[PDB]
Amino acid sequence: PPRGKTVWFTGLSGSGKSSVAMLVERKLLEKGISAYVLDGDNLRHGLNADLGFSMADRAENLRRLSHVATLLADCGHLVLVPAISPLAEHRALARKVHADAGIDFFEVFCDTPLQDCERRDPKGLYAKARAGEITHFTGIDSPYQRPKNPDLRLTPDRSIDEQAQEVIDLLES
Amino acid sequence: PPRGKTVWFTGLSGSGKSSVAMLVERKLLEKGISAYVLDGDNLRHGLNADLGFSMADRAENLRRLSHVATLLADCGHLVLVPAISPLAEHRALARKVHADAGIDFFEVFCDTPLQDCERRDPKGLYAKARAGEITHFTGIDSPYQRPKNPDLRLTPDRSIDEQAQEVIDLLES
Ligand SMILES: Nc1ncnc2c1ncn2[C@@H]1O[C@H](COP(=O)(O)OP(=O)(O)O)[C@@H](O)[C@H]1O
Ligand SMILES: Nc1ncnc2c1ncn2[C@@H]1O[C@H](COP(=O)(O)OP(=O)(O)O)[C@@H](O)[C@H]1O
Ligand SMILES: Nc1ncnc2c1ncn2[C@@H]1O[C@H](COP(=O)(O)OS(=O)(=O)O)[C@@H](O)[C@H]1O
Ligand SMILES: Nc1ncnc2c1ncn2[C@@H]1O[C@H](COP(=O)(O)OS(=O)(=O)O)[C@@H](O)[C@H]1O
Numbered sequence A, B: 001p002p003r004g005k006t007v008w009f010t011g012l013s014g015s016g017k018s019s020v021a022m023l024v025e026r027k028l029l030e031k032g033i034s035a036y037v038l039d040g041d042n043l044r045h046g047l048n049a050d051l052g053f054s055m056a057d058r059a060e061n062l063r064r065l066s067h068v069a070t071l072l073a074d075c076g077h078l079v080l081v082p083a084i085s086p087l088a089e090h091r092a093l094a095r096k097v098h099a100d101a102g103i104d105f106f107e108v109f110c111d112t113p114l115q116d117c118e119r120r121d122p123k124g125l126y127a128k129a130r131a132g133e134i135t136h137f138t139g140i141d142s143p144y145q146r147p148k149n150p151d152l153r154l155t156p157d158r159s160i161d162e163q164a165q166e167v168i169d170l171l172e173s
Helices: A017-030 A055-074 A088-101 A114-120 A125-130 A160-171 B017-030 B055-074 B088-101 B114-120 B125-130 B160-171
Strands: A005-010 A035-037 A078-082 A104-110 A152-154 B005-010 B035-037 B078-082 B104-110 B152-154
Touching: A005 A017, A005 A055, A005 A088, A005 A160, A017 A035, A017 A078, A017 A104, A017 A160, A055 A078, A055 A088, A055 B055, A088 A104, A104 A160, A114 A125, A152 A160, B005 B017, B005 B055, B005 B088, B005 B160, B017 B035, B017 B078, B017 B104, B017 B160, B055 B078, B055 B088, B088 B104, B104 B160, B152 B160
Parallel strands: A005 A078, A005 A104, A035 A078, A104 A152, B005 B078, B005 B104, B035 B078, B104 B152
Antiparallel strands: none
């Protein structure tokens, strides 16, 4: 097989990481490209069921995710990782795990304003955080460090379909 | 893709787990069957780099490995897991993670006697353990519970090639 590669999505909760990732996955699969979405949230329920949201656990979650991505990539998949990845050092770690495994690594920043993300508020998490029912929530009372150099920055200027198509164009260029 | 399955190898250090697993991988791949080895020792240098050989770390190591296997299996691979898995409960846990994920799970016991494993001694570890330079070494001063009912027991009667073929025959029946 060709060895695979990893697309790592960072951004606020509700910024479109999973949507874009899922759509990219379908588009690729429809053209016989074996793509797989390795979702921070889903893994948190099995492999990463023992971790929370302290910066240390998130780093651990993400460290683990980064390894699993390189493993799926080594099996020949195009891996899509939507995960908040709130700190530069989180992304720097993932990148280094990929460098060390000799797997191509692309960073995509889903740069949707906080306003838009909670105007969306799809799982009700912003509301809970503003109410004090969740704490250390990214963008509210836990920081989000903006990537300075992503491979691609997505903005809420276009449809999810078209955002997926930009990810694909990044991969095919 | 149809869903993959897992072959889980248990046995003493130097009993042939990795050798058989690698050879099974190659044989399968040469026939256009997508196979992948998750080797305990290799992954201890990345995903599981944070774990040692306390019984607790070994359980965690093997818990993690079991989740990764099911996930690669779900992607359609035939997953080969050589790892000592020294306790019955370790194997029972992996089996359950697989049952729960609806992935077929086969247990292979590489039943080479301690004496033979020591007499092989490929990485010098038994010697270090006898000398007191390593502690909690499986079979010397850390236990190995022998599987009561593996799907396949491999014995030092055959070449590694032939042992691989038996694993394959097990899968193809
Ligand atoms: N470019 C876009 N245009 C319109 N709506 C979007 C866009 N990106 C995301 N959305 C909507 O906003 C929400 C983003 O949620 P999701 O992708 O789950 O965010 P995340 O995975 O980053 O937490 C979704 O309901 C999606 O429908
Ligand atoms: N059936 C066999 N016949 C001959 N040699 C074997 C057989 N099984 C294993 N070996 C040898 O014994 C050693 C087992 O090593 P390995 O597969 O690394 O064990 P483990 O992964 O179980 O530690 C290897 O050096 C291999 O050369
Ligand atoms: N305190 C929190 N901050 C951000 N997300 C949270 C928090 N608590 C729960 N979550 C949930 O966990 C998901 C984020 O998971 P990841 O992307 O795996 O997080 S990350 O920070 O470690 O990268 C969010 O989509 C949200 O659904
Ligand atoms: N104390 C030890 N006990 C057993 N194996 C060890 C030990 N220290 C280092 N090793 C090396 O680590 C490998 C064992 O790793 P695992 O298969 O991952 O162990 S397991 O118990 O957690 O299943 C061995 O093949 C050997 O190379």
